[PDB]
Design an enzyme around this catalytic site. Structure first.
Site, PDB file in Angstrom:
ATOM      1  N   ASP A  35       0.825  -1.197   0.000  1.00 10.97           N
ATOM      2  CA  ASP A  35       0.000   0.000   0.000  1.00 10.97           C
ATOM      3  C   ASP A  35       0.869   1.262   0.000  1.00 10.97           C
ATOM      4  O   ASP A  35       1.369   1.675   1.047  1.00 10.97           O
ATOM      5  CB  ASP A  35      -0.925  -0.030   1.228  1.00 10.97           C
ATOM      6  CG  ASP A  35      -1.802   1.193   1.342  1.00 10.97           C
ATOM      7  OD1 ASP A  35      -1.924   1.933   0.349  1.00 10.97           O
ATOM      8  OD2 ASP A  35      -2.377   1.396   2.433  1.00 10.97           O
ATOM      9  N   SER A 199      -0.700  15.614 -12.057  1.00  8.67           N
ATOM     10  CA  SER A 199      -0.964  15.248 -13.439  1.00  8.67           C
ATOM     11  C   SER A 199      -1.203  16.514 -14.251  1.00  8.67           C
ATOM     12  O   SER A 199      -1.740  17.499 -13.747  1.00  8.67           O
ATOM     13  CB  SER A 199      -2.171  14.301 -13.506  1.00  8.67           C
ATOM     14  OG  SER A 199      -2.599  14.083 -14.833  1.00  8.67           O
TER      15      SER A 199
END
Length: 330
Positions: A35, A199
């Protein structure tokens, strides 16, 4: 040194991935959920409340000759999905794919929430976010990656998750045969303890690319792609019959639909998520309403590039003094 381990979907939907991890001496192999959105290595154990164990493999520290109680240390964690676990701490030898760390904090669960109990396939979590998020008290502990780092050939690990198929976590090296083209690297902020990046935009299907900054985290422990409501609405508007259902808890779409791809930007590069990756199947057995793999982050408080996005790429988690993230197509 290096390590290389295969990671395997837990079910037919790729709801999560499990990777075998050797703990203790002799080795006890548990299948952990790696994770990158948390920083605790915790396991089902011989100390876990018996009524909260249902099929998981447990770690038994008393059977390990290298286990030592970390005296006075406790841990307690809550995840973004409302699940939780807590307990005490041992140090022991931990190996992943041939890479060994001695003195690793292994957090033994005394209590786990129902979602963990109900998932027989996940024996615990191995956190790979920054050690500043580790919950051990009163002495915070380091992640497996942080402990291994100095010994690694290169201070990196890579995630190569499969679509309905196994994939690979590598530690200490970049497998140049595992991706196509070049890796594009992008800056990381560690201010919240995550692999947080920006992004450069998105496209829906064959549509034009929208240049827009989207801050979010690369999180292998989250199943879906969570993005701003504007972006998510633009995606589902291209699927006839798709709608946001408050009763179901997100966007659903007719199972008869063909889904468009979704592209996200990494600098000047583009990662394309095929439409099929966005299909999470019937909302309930036999339903013709299917659950979407792209969902709004509104009210999460952060955008999450979870498995839906990451499995479309070869992803480098560069833990150099100034960390960065790399993405390649594959």
């Amino acid at each position: 040194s290096t390590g290389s381990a295969t990671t395997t979907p837990i079910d037919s939907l790729d709801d999560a991935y499990i990777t075998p991890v050797q703990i203790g001496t002799p080795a006890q192999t548990l299948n952990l959920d790696f994770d990158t959105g948390s920083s605790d290595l915790w396991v089902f154990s011989s100390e876990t409340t018996a009524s909260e164990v249902d099929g998981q493999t447990i770690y038994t520290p008393s059977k390990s000759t290298t286990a030592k109680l970390l005296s006075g240390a406790t841990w307690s964690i809550s995840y973004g999905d409302g699940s939780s676990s807590s307990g005490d701490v041992y140090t022991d030898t931990v190996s992943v794919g041939g890479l060994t760390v001695t003195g690793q904090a292994v957090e033994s669960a005394k209590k786990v929430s129902s979602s963990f109990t109900e998932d027989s396939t996940i024996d615990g979590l191995l956190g790979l976010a920054f050690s500043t998020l580790n919950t051990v008290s009163p002495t915070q502990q380091k992640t497996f990656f942080d402990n291994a780092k100095a010994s690694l050939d290169s201070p990196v690990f890579t995630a190569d998750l499969g679509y309905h198929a196994p994939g690979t976590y590598n530690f200490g090296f970049i497998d140049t045969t595992a991706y196509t083209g070049s890796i594009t690297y992008t800056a990381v902020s560690t201010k919240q303890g995550f692999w947080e990046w920006t992004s450069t935009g998105y496209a829906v299907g064959s549509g034009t690319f929208k240049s827009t900054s989207i801050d979010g985290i690369a999180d292998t422990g989250t199943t879906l792609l969570y993005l701003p409501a504007t972006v998510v609405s633009a995606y589902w508007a291209q699927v006839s019959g798709a709608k946001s259902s408050s009763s179901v808890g997100g966007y659903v779409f007719p199972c008869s639909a063909t889904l468009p791809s979704f592209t996200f930007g990494v600098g000047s590069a583009r990662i394309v998520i095929p439409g099929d990756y966005i299909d999470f199947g019937p909302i309930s057995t036999g339903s013709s309403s299917c659950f979407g793999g792209i969902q709004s982050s509104a009210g999460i408080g952060i955008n999450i590039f979870g498995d839906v996005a990451l499995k479309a790429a070869f992803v480098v988690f560069n833990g150099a003094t100034t960390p960065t993230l790399g993405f390649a197509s594959k």
